[PDB]
Amino acid sequence: AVQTPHEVVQSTTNELLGDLKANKEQYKSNPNAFYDSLNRILGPVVDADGISRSIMTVKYSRKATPEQMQRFQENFKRSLMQFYGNALLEYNNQGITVDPAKADDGKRASVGMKVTGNNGAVYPVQYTLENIGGEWKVRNVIVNGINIGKLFRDQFADAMQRNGNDLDKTIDGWAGEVAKAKQ
Template identity: 40%
Template sequence: MNLRTLSVVVLLFIATPCSGAISPYESVKSATDDLLAKLNKLRPAYDTDQGHFFSEIDKALAPFVDFEGFSRGVMAKFYRRATPDQRTAFAERFRELLIQTYAKALVEFDNQKVVVREDVKTGRDASRAAVTLDIHGKNGAIYPVEYSLVLKDDVWKLRNVVINGINIGLQFKSQFGFYMQKHRNDIDSVIEAWRVDG
């Protein structure tokens, strides 16, 4: 099971609204169950109408990912150097790339068993939590996926994900840093040129 296939499980959380009135576990469990039921209906559109397919994934992702917070972490030290317009443009570009990445991964998801762990990690900040899913591969291996969540406006939103020990936020950050070096710290050029590897 490759990283792209694993990464589709991000959708298993963000495709369904998650009210702050219920626990992070209940939010993730409900969203996972709902999306697994939708996968078979959505997958055929990838071959017949990719525009529609990407649009549907965009609708699923947009309300429940903290794109601003996620993209700020990816830009890291360069965030402060960016103008408000550049920050907005990068967040939009990041959203586009993230949606494309997981939309393509969606078609590779082959009804693997997904188990949401009930033990939720929390800290002193009640607005943050981490929920782990276990994906059971066909080879018998179990792949842990940890969602980092933040509570914003009574909705649990995705801020980062660690897939089988691979921190996706850090991967995006590394790729962004590479493009900044390549384009001599020209943020506008990076926004225009950046592509996500894989």
């Protein structure tokens, strides 16, 4: 579209924030109104199925029905804003720097970011994007040098071990698994 990988990361960042700042109080009392905004804003620029296919291996992702896949994402997205949503809400904080993106191969692309959080500590963030039908979408993020996509992947792997590879037990108990993946 009308958007390079750089414009995608900031214009979504601006979009997300000017909405979180304005509707904070309704989000603090209405997790579904929150969830609906997060989806309306992130969904169009986040490769949902790509993200999920990678957390499950392609091994397991291939033995998953659409119902299960669709159940997984819902469960995933929802524990995410459960355990991280507060931080975004209480982010009237400032200092959003989207680094000028390097060059891309027209298929993959990187975007860096620095965040001056709750004092003056700068935190680094690399976005990995991917081109899906002429559209740049976020596929992974590295936060404080922690590969997020690899973090949740090893959690799915660990759980599936413990659950003798039952997808439904792993998928229906995944919120509690994202809780553990803080630590």
